[PDB]
Amino acid sequence: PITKEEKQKVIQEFARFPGDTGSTEVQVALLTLRINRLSEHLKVHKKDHHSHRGLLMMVGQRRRLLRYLQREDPERYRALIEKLGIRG
Template sequence: MSYLTPEKKQEIFGTHGKSNSDTGSPEAQIALFSYRISHLTEHLKINKKDFATERSLKKLVGKRRRLLDYLKSKDIERYRSIIKELGIRR
């Protein structure tokens, strides 16, 4: 069973994007990455030696960081709102 069902994706995009089908906006992508990061973090707490997952977690964090930097340079207000909404810290 997958932890990220299509319904869950729709819910994330509906909450943070402009609509349920808005998969491209930085806010929607950052929210999706944050959900995946929290799931992988929980997995790694149990499976400490799973280095492949650790690597993919680091890649995901980097992707989210780059998206946040992009959003920060384009629209600081949207950046601040998504940071506050998701509880991400620098």
């Protein structure tokens, strides 16, 4: 799974400031963690389609944010991406 510690690390490592828990960055970050944890899971259990549905739903929720982030501050965008190592 993912423990508070793990969860907390990434949150901190990404908060735009102390206490920042729900910023576009924090979320995108947190989301990426799940997606990756879940992505690895599916490579092993390829028949667990149900979980896969979640995946598409996260990947899509992530798009929504990044798509937003980029339209508001194309910098924190190229930034958030770079850090997380996303895009293409």
